[PDB]
């Protein structure tokens, strides 16, 4: 505690959470993004909205947050608050009526090399188109488009952590079955700016409905 | 204005700490007298089992640090102070149904030269009231608002009922107060009894 106290005082002395973590303005900061699906809360077929309970795992290096364990009694990891350091402004582009950014400012893990791992919770309300041609035997393809709001791919780069979401701790639904899920990263160039890419990771979930309630209650 | 000088002597010069009980020795108790006024009864929803009410809670205590001599500061005999600068008693509704334990509007406190402090914040409370349906629709219900001090133990803070004076004598206010002239009755519920009790 005493060593950690001194360490956190020496780490936040001349730090400014407004500037990107790069050694030169020409480099970019690489952020490894990953999505953990925990619960499927709802599917509104009228308003076309899907509500999910997720974890937004985010890893990146902050080269100003590093120390030397020998000078602090051997400490190699600490838990700083997240409002104390620079964070990426990841926004859900296809948000419908919830929160665009993260609002639960949970603590983050920091090792002596400056590598940061932050894993805050979030309720995602996404605008999902609902084809109803085959209801109650319908399959839906719902997406979650994520990206950096104010920066381009030359200043802040994002890259998926795995080829497909993490559903290892997924709570079974009762109305829906998860058939497939994948994440794809896209590069977008505009006619105005010839060599500036705009990046986004899009996760999709192919959802099959369980048609027992509606067969026993309506058909 | 001489209020600026008074309030600066009280809060800044005398290094007032608002996270310390108003007592000279740690072994004494702060007596807080409490009252409740019903402004209006909004609803008693039978499906949710929730009473919604508009009440004005009324506190009174003593702070020996908020004392002055009127003659030495013009003749100031009363003072208004924001609740976020002085120590206040945190009394919460414990049987609420939502996450609203506190009053709604943190109004000013009034302080007199002897150190008597008064505070009347208004509040909207949603409380748990189990419904007796045995005689519905000719039923009468017994709803209660339970108030507790969860920041100090009974050896440090004592709750009491407030007192009045008729002819030099004191009596405790064992009822909810209702203005008989500014009260609009509820469309479905008429009040029969409204007691108040300090429970040990």
């Amino acid at each position: 505690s005493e060593h950690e106290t001194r360490l956190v005082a020496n780490l936040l002395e001349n730090y400014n959470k407004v500037i990107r973590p790069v050694e030169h303005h020409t480099h970019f900061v690489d952020i490894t993004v990953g999505l953990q699906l925990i619960q499927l809360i709802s599917v509104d077929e009228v308003n076309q909205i899907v509500e999910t309970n997720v974890r937004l795992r985010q890893q990146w290096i902050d080269v100003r947050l590093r120390w030397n364990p020998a000078d602090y009694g051997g400490i190699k990891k600490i838990r700083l608050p997240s409002d104390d350091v620079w964070l990426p402004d990841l926004v859900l582009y296809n948000n419908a009526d919830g929160d665009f950014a993260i609002v639960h400012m949970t603590k983050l893990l920091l090792d002596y090399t400056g590598k940061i791992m932050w894993t805050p919770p979030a309720i995602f309300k996404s605008y999902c188109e609902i084809i109803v041609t085959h209801f109650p035997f319908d399959q839906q393809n719902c997406t979650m488009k994520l990206g950096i709001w104010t920066y381009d791919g030359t200043k802040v780069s994002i890259s998926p952590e795995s080829d497909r979401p993490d559903l290892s701790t997924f709570m079974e639904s009762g109305e829906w079955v998860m058939k497939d899920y994948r994440g794809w990263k896209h590069w977008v160039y505009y006619t105005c700016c010839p060599d500036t890419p705009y990046l986004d990771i899009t996760y999709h979930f192919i959802m099959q409905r369980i048609p027992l309630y509606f067969v026993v209650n309506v058909i | 204005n001489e209020e600026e000088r008074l309030i600066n002597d009280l809060l800044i010069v005398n290094k007032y700490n608002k996270h310390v009980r108003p007592v000279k020795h740690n072994n004494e108790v702060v007596n807080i007298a409490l009252s409740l006024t019903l402004s209006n009864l909004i609803s008693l929803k039978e499906t949710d089992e929730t009473l919604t009410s508009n009440v004005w809670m009324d506190h009174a205590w003593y702070d020996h640090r908020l004392t002055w001599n009127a003659s030495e500061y013009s003749d100031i005999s009363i003072l208004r102070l924001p609740p976020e600068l002085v120590w206040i008693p945190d009394i919460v509704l414990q049987n609420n149904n939502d996450g609203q334990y506190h009053v709604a509007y943190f109004c000013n406190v009034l302080v007199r030269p002897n150190g008597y402090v008064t505070w009347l914040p208004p509040a909207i409370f949603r409380s748990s009231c189990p419904i007796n349906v045995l005689y519905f629709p000719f039923d009468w219900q017994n709803c209660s608002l339970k108030f507790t001090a969860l920041n100090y133990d009974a050896n440090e803070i004592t709750m009491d009922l407030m007192t009045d004076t008729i002819d030099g004598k004191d009596y405790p206010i064992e009822w909810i107060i209702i203005d008989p002239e500014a009260f609009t009755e509820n469309g479905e519920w008429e009040i029969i009894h409204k007691p108040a009790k300090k429970n040990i």
Binding site: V188, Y189, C192, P194 | -
Partner: protein, 62 residues
């Protein structure tokens, strides 16, 4: 069978279409940030806000 497949104002790049494909397209539209051009193989169906062109020659979708 050979089309351009670069986007917007990127340096030129080509692709070989699948056997039996004879066309090349050029989609243009504007989003909140600017104008995007999509060049590829075939002739697809586009929503009623896109400037779609199709050509049956070779490298004629620029």
């Amino acid at each position: 069978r050979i089309c351009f497949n670069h986007q917007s104002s990127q340096p030129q790049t080509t692709k070989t279409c699948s056997p039996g494909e004879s066309s090349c397209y050029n989609k243009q539209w504007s989003d909140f940030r600017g104008t995007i051009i999509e060049r590829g193989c075939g002739c697809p169906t586009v929503k009623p806000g896109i400037k779609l062109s199709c050509c049956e020659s070779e490298v004629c979708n620029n």
